[PDB]
Amino acid sequence: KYQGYDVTDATHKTSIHNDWKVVVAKKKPARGVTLTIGIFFDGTGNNRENTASRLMKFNECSAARQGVNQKDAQSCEDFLKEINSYRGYYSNIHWLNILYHPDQVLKKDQTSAQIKTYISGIGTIGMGLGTSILDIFEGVVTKTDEAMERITQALSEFMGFNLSPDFCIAKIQFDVFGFSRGAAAARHFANRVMEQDPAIARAIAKGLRGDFYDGKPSGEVRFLGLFDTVAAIGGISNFFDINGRSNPGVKLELRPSVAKKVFQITAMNEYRYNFSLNSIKGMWPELALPGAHSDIGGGYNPVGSPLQENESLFLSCPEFEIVSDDTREMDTRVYRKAEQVRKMLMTLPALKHILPHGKLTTKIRSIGVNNSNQRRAGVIQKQVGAAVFFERMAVPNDWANVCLRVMLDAAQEAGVLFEPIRQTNTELQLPSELIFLADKAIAQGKAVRLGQEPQAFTEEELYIIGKYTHCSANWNIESDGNLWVDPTTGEIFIHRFGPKGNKAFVFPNKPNDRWIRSVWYM
Amino acid sequence: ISADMQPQAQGKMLDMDEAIRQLEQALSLARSMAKAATAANATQGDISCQQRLNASLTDLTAPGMLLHAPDGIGMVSARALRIASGSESVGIMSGDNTDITAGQSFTVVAEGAVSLLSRNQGMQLLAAKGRVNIQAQSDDLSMSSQQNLDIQSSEGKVTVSANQELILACGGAYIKLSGGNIELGCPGQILLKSTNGGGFILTDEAGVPQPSTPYRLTTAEGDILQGITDENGKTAPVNTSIPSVVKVEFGKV
Amino acid sequence: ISADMQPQAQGKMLDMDEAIRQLEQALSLARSMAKAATAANATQGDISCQQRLNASLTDLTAPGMLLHAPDGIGMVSARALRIASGSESVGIMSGDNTDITAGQSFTVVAEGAVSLLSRNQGMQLLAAKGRVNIQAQSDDLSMSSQQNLDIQSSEGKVTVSANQELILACGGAYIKLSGGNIELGCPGQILLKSTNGGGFILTDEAGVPQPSTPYRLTTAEGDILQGITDENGKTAPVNTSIPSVVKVEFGKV
Amino acid sequence: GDNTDITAGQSFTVVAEGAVSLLSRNQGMQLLAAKGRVNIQAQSDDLSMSSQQNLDIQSSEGKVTVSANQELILACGGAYIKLSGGNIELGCP
């Protein structure tokens, strides 16, 4: 259906007569190559989260938005430092981008191709810190724009690999994969391809350098691989400096014609406040799978690394109180509250399988109170703080490979062509504990991709998984000197001229109320 | 009057170390800016009296008032406030901004000069509503720039009137309106505008002149000429200096 | 320090309900104006530190100083006065005007920007005597207006001089003084103007054409043209498009 | 009695709900930006810049662009240049 030209008259000189020489060409029929660009929108990868992203988490999770004043927040920091930034590991988008079969040079009759591009995660200053937090807020749409420029340069590289083509690109398809805000960016991009955005067509054309391709000018999406859509981690609604900026024009709704096949895994055991799920349940195939956020997406360090995941977590917000130095610390309101919430957590079905793999206690702290007035009354005072603590050393990150393989099976069902995981990929081979479970999870994935309801994991397998599942939600406090939070309204004020020496405290991994993750549907 | 803690009354009755630090830091900022105001040909502040105030307030060697609070001072009232120095200067110093927020109007009447010097981030003199009026009511007005200067009325007229002479000059060329004459002099030319090569032949060897064919010419220097052949297979006219350009094509059938 | 009555010591030592209203109201005003400054692209004031001050001074939760007087505060001295914030901002908030009256100069030196935003009644930057000098000493200057912009010297010269180009543009027409050339381009015409029908005759039937007679014509559209006939009784010329004029007269003898 | 000096380590800001008025009586007015852009706008109304004696607008190293929307008039002593419509008119006695 396409034809090129056997051209041999490919030069002519420049003159004052303005001549037009000739191009003699017998017409050659050209291959119609269906080209697929694999789009891989990562979450935060093997990187640290930048300040602007970590500050967004102050929104609704400030110590001040809770009843934690600047003294109690410092006591929480002290109490955690008495018991015991973070760089993550490679996500499944990294391993899917690695296993995505790239084709540099087409075969003489290869009718289908695949090239890939990798877009980084959204979070990877003073005067500019407000606008950088705004950049993180609009990161989804800006990441889709970066996907445009990335598609351009990926196409330019691919066709620079195939100089003097004999083939015509009979279609531009898209295989868009995402994780956690690249899942939001992936959904937004899939919409932008559904709306047939002109910037996608401009990107394809700039990569092809004016060449022809026969299809929808902005392409089409074949498979959308989502891992745990979290459109926003934090917000700007409480930042005085930037809350005026409206919500970004993010489009996450996936209408039946947005992609040929859509499949999303989700974290069953993700309960953080800031990580609220955008579900495609009911509408598209979505597989709730046991594990935390990055136990689905992958970004947890291996069980031997220096960045080994050792969990020293406050499972309750530390509460403090000043009492008499004679008072036994276990006879205080804070200790009773902590033991109450500990017994609630042992009863809690959310952590039913995670807790048996670590130590769940109530830590008690008691420091001396200098009260000179009460000293004269003979009253010496102590400040007793108590919270529920969870120790778990050496948490293995081998459940992300199960989710990686479920994604691979979903995508290969959609026709996406992946290089198999061979034993040279030692980061992706499963412990013998997990082989049967990975197979059952792949079967659950297919059962959902067949519209059925999957054979759920039984209590013994789920206990086995609890060893590989991370407890992502906690009340470990963090601080920053780039913000001041109003102690009454909880409004965040960015320090524009450098830190004023204070510390604003946040619970970034704070669990959602009652440990039920917020899910937004569509 | 100090909100500084001196526990157990251990120390002098007038220990004002943090108040003296604030006075010294305020004066050394005012002095850095006096050097900057001079370097910029702005009017200088009265450092003499602020330096004399540091002497008077430090240890209260003169009957002054020193009000110090480590965490901020608020001087509030529903009625009018007055900060007045009868014979010397009022100094307002800031580590951060100095913000004035008038619910009606910000008025300044200086018997000498009014000087506003910004050192790093420019100057914004905006009226969101109302007319902006800038007058040298009895003298010269000079408005200059180092880089580009833009005078613009986005929806109205620009009128530039002079009484004796109106000269526009740039690079020797000038337009002078004076006497009752217009004069357009220039070292070069005065230009009045009522205004403001070759391809390839892509043809089938049998004779079909290949309508609607993609192409793009690559000159023998590094230029691209995208386009689609037209009207029996023409390309775009190329007039690069004198290279030997190259030809490529594809298309649908 | 409070000039507020707490009759018979009935109340807390630190009852500052009216001081708090003054602090809340000032920060409320500062914050609404900070939104106005952002909408107007002015430099924003430091709301952050004035927001901590409200926190600190309200019930004196931090060691600050709150001076309140329901009927006004005067801080006067014959010598210098200093209001200085070492690390944060000075905020002068006002329900009515903020008036600065300097017997000598009024000078501002800001290490960052100087932004004067007026919201409703415009901006007057006047020098009754002395030269007005507006400089972007290292950058662009932009003087913009939405409505008419007027630059005038009432008794002297106006000189607009650029270094690399002087462009005057309006509606496609432009005058560019550049290189050493002058370029007058327009879509329309360049016009160099170096140079700056019908009525009645009221005559007596005997023949004397009735001089000095008042008349007034009414064209058949709604326009009126008074006048007096003259020395054989001429009328003023009429040039309405296609009318049927009407005539009336009176006069003296 | 002497100067009123404001010295800001950061910006100096004024937002007046009504007018901002600076009146020098004897020694002129310096509105200087040692660095940064000077932006003078009547964002919704007229801008009048007047002088009694000589008025000097200058860009020492860049361009000067005067730009109008409906009419640009330069006038002095009966002579005028009017950029209006799409026409340039130079009239002088």
Short mmCIF file of C-alpha atoms in Angstrom, two decimals, chain B residues 121-251:
data_model
loop_
_atom_site.label_atom_id
_atom_site.label_comp_id
_atom_site.label_asym_id
_atom_site.label_seq_id
_atom_site.Cartn_x
_atom_site.Cartn_y
_atom_site.Cartn_z
CA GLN B 121 15.79 42.92 41.46
CA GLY B 122 14.59 46.03 39.79
CA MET B 123 11.81 48.44 40.48
CA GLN B 124 8.08 48.10 39.88
CA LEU B 125 5.99 51.27 39.94
CA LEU B 126 2.53 49.98 39.12
CA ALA B 127 -0.93 51.45 39.35
CA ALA B 128 -3.47 48.67 38.97
CA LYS B 129 -6.06 51.40 38.52
CA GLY B 130 -5.76 55.13 38.32
CA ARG B 131 -3.43 57.34 36.34
CA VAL B 132 0.34 57.22 36.76
CA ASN B 133 1.81 60.71 36.70
CA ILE B 134 5.55 61.37 36.74
CA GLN B 135 6.62 64.99 36.72
CA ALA B 136 9.75 67.01 37.09
CA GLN B 137 7.51 69.98 37.69
CA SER B 138 10.32 72.50 37.45
CA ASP B 139 13.38 70.72 36.06
CA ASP B 140 14.70 67.97 33.82
CA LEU B 141 13.34 64.47 33.68
CA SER B 142 15.74 61.76 32.59
CA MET B 143 14.51 58.22 32.09
CA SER B 144 17.29 55.93 30.96
CA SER B 145 18.15 52.28 30.57
CA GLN B 146 21.25 50.30 29.86
CA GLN B 147 19.47 47.61 27.87
CA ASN B 148 16.26 47.93 25.86
CA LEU B 149 13.80 50.65 26.80
CA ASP B 150 10.13 50.10 25.96
CA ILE B 151 7.46 52.78 26.00
CA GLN B 152 4.09 51.39 25.16
CA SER B 153 0.40 52.15 25.33
CA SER B 154 -1.34 48.85 24.85
CA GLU B 155 -4.76 50.24 23.98
CA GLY B 156 -4.39 53.98 23.54
CA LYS B 157 -2.25 56.70 22.09
CA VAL B 158 1.36 57.57 22.69
CA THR B 159 1.90 61.31 22.45
CA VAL B 160 5.40 62.72 22.78
CA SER B 161 5.29 66.51 22.88
CA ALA B 162 8.16 68.93 23.28
CA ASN B 163 8.19 72.70 23.40
CA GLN B 164 11.53 73.61 21.83
CA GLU B 165 12.80 70.53 20.07
CA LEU B 166 12.00 66.84 19.78
CA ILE B 167 15.02 64.78 18.77
CA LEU B 168 15.05 61.05 18.13
CA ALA B 169 18.57 59.79 17.59
CA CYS B 170 20.22 56.43 17.03
CA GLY B 171 23.60 55.76 15.47
CA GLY B 172 24.00 59.03 13.62
CA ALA B 173 20.50 59.00 12.24
CA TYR B 174 18.21 61.53 13.83
CA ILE B 175 14.74 63.00 13.48
CA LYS B 176 14.47 66.52 14.84
CA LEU B 177 11.21 68.42 15.17
CA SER B 178 12.06 72.04 15.87
CA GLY B 179 11.35 75.53 14.68
CA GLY B 180 8.35 74.46 12.70
CA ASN B 181 10.38 72.05 10.63
CA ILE B 182 10.96 68.33 10.48
CA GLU B 183 14.50 67.17 9.83
CA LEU B 184 15.45 63.58 9.05
CA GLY B 185 19.24 63.44 8.88
CA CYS B 186 21.31 60.28 8.71
CA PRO B 187 24.73 59.11 7.52
CA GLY B 188 23.16 56.35 5.47
CA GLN B 189 19.92 56.09 3.54
CA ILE B 190 16.37 57.14 4.33
CA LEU B 191 14.00 54.38 3.27
CA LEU B 192 10.26 54.87 2.79
CA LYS B 193 8.43 51.58 2.36
CA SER B 194 4.81 51.39 1.28
CA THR B 195 5.48 47.64 1.72
CA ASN B 196 5.43 47.13 5.45
CA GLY B 197 16.15 29.05 -6.95
CA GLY B 198 15.93 25.63 -8.55
CA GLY B 199 14.85 22.16 -7.50
CA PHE B 200 14.70 18.57 -8.70
CA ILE B 201 12.34 16.80 -11.11
CA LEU B 202 11.00 13.64 -9.46
CA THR B 203 9.36 11.78 -12.32
CA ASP B 204 8.64 8.12 -12.92
CA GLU B 205 10.96 6.68 -15.54
CA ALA B 206 7.83 5.99 -17.62
CA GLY B 207 6.67 9.61 -17.48
CA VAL B 208 4.31 10.12 -14.53
CA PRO B 209 5.32 13.40 -12.82
CA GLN B 210 4.84 12.02 -9.29
CA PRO B 211 2.12 14.23 -7.76
CA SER B 212 1.86 14.64 -3.98
CA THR B 213 5.23 13.13 -3.06
CA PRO B 214 7.14 13.77 0.18
CA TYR B 215 10.70 15.03 -0.07
CA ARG B 216 13.32 17.00 1.79
CA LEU B 217 16.51 18.51 0.38
CA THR B 218 19.79 18.22 2.27
CA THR B 219 22.22 20.88 1.09
CA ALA B 220 25.92 20.07 1.09
CA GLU B 221 26.45 22.21 4.17
CA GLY B 222 23.90 20.96 6.71
CA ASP B 223 20.54 22.49 5.80
CA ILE B 224 17.21 20.67 5.56
CA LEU B 225 14.36 21.66 3.25
CA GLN B 226 11.26 19.68 4.17
CA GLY B 227 8.21 19.68 1.93
CA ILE B 228 6.00 17.65 -0.37
CA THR B 229 6.38 17.78 -4.15
CA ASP B 230 3.76 19.81 -5.98
CA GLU B 231 2.00 20.11 -9.30
CA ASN B 232 3.81 17.54 -11.45
CA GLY B 233 6.66 17.06 -8.96
CA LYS B 234 8.33 20.38 -8.24
CA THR B 235 10.39 21.05 -5.13
CA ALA B 236 11.13 24.25 -3.29
CA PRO B 237 13.56 26.75 -4.86
CA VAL B 238 17.00 26.51 -3.24
CA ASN B 239 19.41 29.44 -3.25
CA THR B 240 22.17 28.43 -0.85
CA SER B 241 25.54 29.90 -1.86
CA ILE B 242 26.61 27.13 -4.25
CA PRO B 243 26.37 23.60 -2.76
CA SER B 244 25.35 20.25 -4.29
CA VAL B 245 22.15 19.29 -2.49
CA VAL B 246 20.70 15.79 -2.12
CA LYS B 247 17.23 14.35 -2.73
CA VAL B 248 15.04 11.85 -0.81
CA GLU B 249 11.42 10.71 -1.11
CA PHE B 250 8.72 8.32 0.13
CA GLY B 251 4.93 8.24 0.12
#
